Design a protein around this ligand. Structure first.
Ligand SMILES: OC[C@H]1O[C@@](CO)(OC[C@@]2(O[C@H]3O[C@H](CO)[C@@H](O)[C@H](O)[C@H]3O)O[C@H](CO)[C@@H](O)[C@@H]2O)[C@@H](O)[C@@H]1O
Ligand SMILES: [Ca+2]
Length: 519
């Protein structure tokens, strides 16, 4: 005959719940709730925020929905017909997560000898073939056909050592300082990820408008996690049943006004605020009204899969400061996470920080199906046929204090099914010279692995403008570019790339055979 003890008594009464209708089991569970107010791991994507993001996605609100693309205009990247790192032969690769070489303070796409430079993950569809390649075009050239491939940064290789996403900026001497994810799969095929850096020197043959990779120097591991702020591989190994995600990837370089250099990356929380059964009882993870939190608590407890996911979810967007050894960096300081999602999601990807005026904007991509709340993300699949989103936050300070945009953190939401040609992911905001209140959203279009059909390859999406509002909101704009345009200027807009959600329109968001096809 247990009795409610402490703050939870007040919670139950506030919620209009009849205390005598509670079982002993329910009372015992309620008595385990910890009402501590102390935030342990930065700004949180709470259970309520997640529910709101999913709900907003289902609403397909023009403010946040990814614009429809003209499906008939989407092509595989010509520069993706290229030597493959794992075969040494010319093959038709697909291309996904990509990033421009950009100025570290402003994020502006860098002009290197009249060229723009982009590094991206490419490989053969349905092969474990994860390596990074250098692509280049004349600076400001909007023609997707003009991009060329300088080849894989690290030359030929195998799945034992992979390269996943990062960022890149120029050194004073004209070399590229590349930040990337080195992945070692030698321990029972696990994706053992580490933040790495290398210096890339280029050869330019002016008359052939041809760039090649000349030297790759100083390749080394920068950060693997500290164990307190961020989970280490050894920590992950200790407890993994198969249900725990590994993350130490997607490093985004940014410099502050004083020239200090930071990497903002995807990880998981360490012992500062670790995953586990205890997370279900931390009231601060819920983030709704007390009454809604109470409903959520019982929902998690009553659903075995949700409960399991809640125990393992601890995605974080971390930050470290580097020392001043630009070409051979070491870690100078490890900070608490900027954002974390204990209890809520075990995957938040591709973080991107842009300084606009005197404020820092942090965006990240996520697939809501990696969230703990199955009921919420399953509903997004039912409504739209996909569950992708971009989330966003703003701070007056680079290393802490982030506030969610559009209340919940929602910024972009999926608008077409995941297996359509015009599905997108890996949103990456790029600042726009001469427009300090807008960002150009780049992404890849078509999901990997021929899910949209044989020959339909992941390729660079048409880019679109996002309006940033000083009142901590954002608005998708009806302004779109050619595929693979990283630089918004006065020749960038191409309204022909815009689509409509109509079966038989020439600019349909669906290719023939997709409208009404199973997801
Ligand atoms: O390719 C690595 C690169 O992709 C990112 C997201 O852009 O991680 C994505 C991720 O999932 C992709 O691949 C899985 C197949 O297992 C698929 O289910 C999903 O639809 C894809 O987005 O890639 C790794 C390995 O597959 C997963 O850990 C991760 O979920 C980015 O963070 C990373 O640099
Ligand atoms: Ca986890």
């Amino acid at each position: 005959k247990a009795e409610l003890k402490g703050q939870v008594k007040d919670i139950v009464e506030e919620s209009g719940v009849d205390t005598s209708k509670l079982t002993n089991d329910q009372i015992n569970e309620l008595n385990k709730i910890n009402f501590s107010k102390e935030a342990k791991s930065g700004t949180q994507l709470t259970y309520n925020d997640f529910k709101k993001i999913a709900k907003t996605l289902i609403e397909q609100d023009a403010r946040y929905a990814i614009p429809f693309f003209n499906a008939s205009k989407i092509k595989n990247m010509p520069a993706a017909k290229t030597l493959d790192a794992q075969s040494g032969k010319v093959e038709d690769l697909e291309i996904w997560d990509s990033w421009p070489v950009q100025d570290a303070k402003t994020g502006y796409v860098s002009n290197w000898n009249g060229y723009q430079l982009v590094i991206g993950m490419m490989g053969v569809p349905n092969v474990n073939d994860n390596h990074i390649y250098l692509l280049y075009n004349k600076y400001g050239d909007n023609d997707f056909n003009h991009w060329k491939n300088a080849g894989p940064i690290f030359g030929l290789g195998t799945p034992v050592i992979q390269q996943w996403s990062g960022s890149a900026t120029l050194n004073k001497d004209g070399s590229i300082q590349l930040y990337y994810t080195k992945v070692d799969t030698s321990d029972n095929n696990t994706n053992h990820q580490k933040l790495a850096s290398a210096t890339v020197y280029l050869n330019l043959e002016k008359d052939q408008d041809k760039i090649s990779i000349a030297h790759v120097d100083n390749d080394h591991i920068v950060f693997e996690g500290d164990g307190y702020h961020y989970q280490t591989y050894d920590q992950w190994k200790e407890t993994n049943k198969g249900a725990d995600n590994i993350a130490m990837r997607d490093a985004h370089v940014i410099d502050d006004d004083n020239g200090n250099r930071y990497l903002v990356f995807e990880a998981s929380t360490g012992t500062e605020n670790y995953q586990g059964d205890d997370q279900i009882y931390q009231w601060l993870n819920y983030g709704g009204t007390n009454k809604d939190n109470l409903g959520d608590f019982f929902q998690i407890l009553s659903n075995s899969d949700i409960k399991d996911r809640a125990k393992w979810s601890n995605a974080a967007i971390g930050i470290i400061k580097l020392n001043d050894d630009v070409k051979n960096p070491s870690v100078a300081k490890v900070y608490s996470p900027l954002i974390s999602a204990p209890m809520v999601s075990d995957e938040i990807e591709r973080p991107d920080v842009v300084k606009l005026g005197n404020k820092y904007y942090l965006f990240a991509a996520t697939r809501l199906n990696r969230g703990s709340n199955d009921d919420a993300w399953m509903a997004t699949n039912k409504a739209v046929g996909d569950n992708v989103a971009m989330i966003g936050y703003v701070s007056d300070n680079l290393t802490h204090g982030y506030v969610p945009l559009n209340e919940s953190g929602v910024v972009l939401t999926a608008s077409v099914p995941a297996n359509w040609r015009t599905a997108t992911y890996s949103y990456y905001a790029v600042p726009v010279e001469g427009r300090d209140d807008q960002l150009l959203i780049t992404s890849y279009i078509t999901n990997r692995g021929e899910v949209a059909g044989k020959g339909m390859h992941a390729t660079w999406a048409p880019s679109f403008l996002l309006q940033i509002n000083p009142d901590n909101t954002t608005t998708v704009l009806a302004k779109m570019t050619n595929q693979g345009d990283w630089i918004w200027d006065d020749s960038s807009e191409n309204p022909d790339m815009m689509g409509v959600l109509e079966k038989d329109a020439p600019n349909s968001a669906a290719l023939p055979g997709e409208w009404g096809k199973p997801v």
